[PDB]
Symmetry: D2
Subunit: 115 residues, 4 copies
Amino acid sequence: CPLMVKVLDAVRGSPAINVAMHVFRKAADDTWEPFASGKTSESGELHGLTTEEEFVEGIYKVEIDTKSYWKALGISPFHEHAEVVFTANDSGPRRYTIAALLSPYSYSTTAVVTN
Amino acid sequence: CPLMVKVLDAVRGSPAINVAMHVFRKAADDTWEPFASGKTSESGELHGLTTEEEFVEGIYKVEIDTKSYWKALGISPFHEHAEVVFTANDSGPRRYTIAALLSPYSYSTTAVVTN
Amino acid sequence: CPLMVKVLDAVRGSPAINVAMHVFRKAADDTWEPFASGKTSESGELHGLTTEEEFVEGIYKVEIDTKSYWKALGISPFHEHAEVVFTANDSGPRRYTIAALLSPYSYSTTAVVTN
Amino acid sequence: CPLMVKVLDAVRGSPAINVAMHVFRKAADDTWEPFASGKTSESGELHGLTTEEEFVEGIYKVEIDTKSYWKALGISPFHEHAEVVFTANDSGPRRYTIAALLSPYSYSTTAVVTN
Ligand SMILES: O=C(O)c1cc(-c2ccc(F)cc2F)ccc1O
Ligand SMILES: O=C(O)c1cc(-c2ccc(F)cc2F)ccc1O
């Protein structure tokens, strides 16, 4: 599993469950092409987005639909979404864990990159 | 000054100086139109991006070139940039301060909305 | 003003106003001695904690009463308080700004050290 | 496992390995009594600090020795340690995951509380 995302809710102190996200890869013509998508599980985790063979060098974008998450809890948040944009695998294949911590007016994202 | 950005460096404990950023507004045709831009000052702050008459309701994107900042310090970063996307909505007088805290593999952004 | 504290509320996107905090300095006998205290202003800031002559090298602790802040808003928090412990060291002129970003189950603190 | 701690390094984008931490419980005489301690593993995790029977209602303090971690990497950091203080189990037994994200001049801590 070369790409995993974990999302946490800083207001309730819980995993952020059923959070949708879309992954894009920058194409040759400088456009964002859809690549994968899914929703976080009861543990706040989204696995199985891609495979080693499919996850080639490139620039990737993870767009996390934080607004729909907060609206479902009755909170009108600041951000439309949380976007993580990064170059992947340019020194060789790596495993990426993207962690996102959500508040209505704030978010933090961090990457753990292992071999 | 209805829109201000402040950027901080978590590795050196300093304002992040000379950080470039561009502000975009979502057009009717779902495209991002350039709106404003600048570089942070010695205090890590960018002022004067827009005016009250110009800063109307809409969806805005602030793209902060964090990668160029870390490259200038010789540090290898994860993110291509830090992106803040939000709807601006005047429910009464509102000033927006976007704060971004930068580390090579992590960033946090928060909005302070005042009257 | 060699030492300033700023506190922000990630749930409401506002300065955290009327937040009490105490500053302690580590004594020779490894005990915490009260040093300064106050409450944040309408801007979320606390100034005038100490002076240049008084703020000597040593180990300092800032204890921010985050629990009372969340209780005043009717929100159930995790932490008893947010604690920032640090050594102050003049290697040349140094001013310290401690920034704290508060959520009910999370807090972030950062130091900006300027000349 | 009622209490787990995970620590991440925001400069290297990796788990923070071999990070020491001590857990204290506030005693009847308002003193902090040592309770448990350990070091994070290669995954940045510390498990097995306590048991359900031992982890009674109370106020707990987790002191993470972040300074020794950064010094071992040749970085002089701002904080002496990262302290997480909280009331545990006052509505019944819970499982607590404490997550800490470390930078030389900043840290964030978050709690995930599950039944
Ligand atoms: O770790 C924090 O407490 C923190 C602090 C800031 C911040 C810093 C300095 C300042 F003048 C204003 C701020 F919002 C911005 C983001 C952030 O996460
Ligand atoms: O407050 C923090 O220290 C923090 C923690 C995480 C995080 C999330 C999930 C996880 F399994 C480990 C983490 F460190 C993600 C972001 C973050 O700011």
